[PDB]
C-alpha cells in the first residue's frame, strides 16, 4: 500500500529511467538470467545471448509497463489489468520470479542512478515493484 511519499519517490526516481527504458529493462533481464538461471525456464523461445534483439525488446516492454504503472500509480489495478490477465491466464510465471526480477530491477536502478537511489527511495521502489507484482499475480487463481 503506497503512501503519498512512496508515490512521490517512485515518480521522481523513475524519472531518468524513462529514456533508458529498453536499456535498463534489458540489463535487468540479463542480470536476472545470470543471477537466477531458473528464470530462463520461462524464455526457452528466446535467444538469451548477451545483447539479443529479443531480450532488448522484452526489456523495453517491461520497462514501459512499469513507466505506465508509475504514471498511474493511483489506479494501478486498472492500468495493469490487461498485463495481469496475460500473466494469469497465459504466461503463468510462478509468483516467486517476480521478486527475482524486482530485485534485479532495483540493482539496475542502483547501478545507474546513484544520486536517486537513497535509502528512502530504495524502500519506496521495492514496495512499488512488490505492488506491481501483486497486481500482476492477482488473477492467478
Amino acid at each position: 500500500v503506497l503512501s503519498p511519499a512512496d508515490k512521490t519517490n517512485v515518480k521522481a526516481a523513475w524519472g531518468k529511467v524513462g529514456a533508458h527504458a529498453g536499456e535498463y529493462g534489458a540489463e535487468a533481464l540479463e542480470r536476472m538470467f545470470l543471477s537466477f538461471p531458473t528464470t530462463k525456464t520461462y524464455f526457452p523461445h528466446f535467444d538469451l545471448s548477451h545483447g539479443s534483439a529479443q531480450v532488448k525488446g522484452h526489456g523495453k516492454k517491461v520497462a514501459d509497463a512499469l513507466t505506465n504503472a508509475v504514471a498511474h500509480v493511483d489506479d494501478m489495478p486498472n492500468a495493469l489489468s490487461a498485463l495481469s490477465d496475460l500473466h494469469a491466464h497465459k504466461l503463468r510465471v510462478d509468483p516467486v520470479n517476480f521478486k527475482l526480477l524486482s530485485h534485479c530491477l532495483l540493482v539496475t536502478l542502483a547501478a545507474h542512478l546513484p544520486a536517486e537511489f537513497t535509502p528512502a527511495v530504495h524502500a519506496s521502489l521495492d514496495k512499488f515493484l512488490a505492488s506491481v507484482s501483486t497486481v500482476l499475480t492477482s488473477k492467478y487463481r
Binding site: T41, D94, Y140
Partner: protein, 146 residues
C-alpha cells in the same frame, strides 16, 4: 539436506503403506487445481478447466504415477538425492523447461495428500521427516539447472 536415522525410518515405514499410483495421481491433480498456473506444462493433457476435470483426467493420473514412481525410487537413496535425480534434473531444465519452484509446490501438495490419506498417523514428527524429504528432492531436481 541430510535426514537423521529416526526420520529415514519414519519415511520408509510410512511409504510402505502407500499405493504410489493412487497418491501420484492425487498429488499431481491437486497441484494443477490448487496452483492452476502449473497447468502451463500440461496443455497436452487436454481439459484441466475444472477441479473435477483435472482429477478425472486420465493423462494427469498416468503422469502422476510416473512422477511419484521416480520419487518413490528416490527414497532408496535419501543420502544421495542429488546424484540419484541428476538425470531428471537435466531433463526438467534442458528439455522440459520447468521452473524448480514447481517441485516445491508439488512437495507441499504431496504432504497434504499424505496427511489427508493417513489422517492421525501422519503425525507432526512424520510430517517433519517428509518435509525434509520433499525439500531434498526439490533441491536435487533443481541442482543441475543452468
Amino acid at each position: 539436506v541430510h535426514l537423521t536415522p529416526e526420520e529415514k525410518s519414519a519415511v520408509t515405514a510410512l511409504w510402505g503403506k502407500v499405493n504410489v499410483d493412487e497418491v501420484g495421481g492425487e498429488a499431481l491433480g491437486r497441484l494443477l487445481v490448487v496452483y492452476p498456473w502449473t497447468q502451463r506444462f500440461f496443455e497436452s493433457f487436454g481439459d484441466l478447466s475444472t477441479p473435477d476435470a483435472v482429477m478425472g483426467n486420465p493423462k494427469v493420473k498416468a503422469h502422476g504415477k510416473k512422477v511419484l514412481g521416480a520419487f518413490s525410487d528416490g527414497l532408496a537413496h535419501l543420502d544421495n538425492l542429488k546424484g540419484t535425480f541428476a538425470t531428471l534434473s537435466e531433463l526438467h531444465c534442458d528439455k522440459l523447461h520447468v521452473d524448480p519452484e514447481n517441485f516445491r509446490l508439488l512437495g507441499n501438495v504431496l504432504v497434504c495428500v499424505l496427511a489427508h490419506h493417513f489422517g492421525k498417523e501422519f503425525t507432526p514428527p512424520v510430517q517433519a521427516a517428509y518435509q525434509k524429504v520433499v525439500a531434498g528432492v526439490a533441491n536435487a531436481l533443481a541442482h543441475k539447472y543452468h
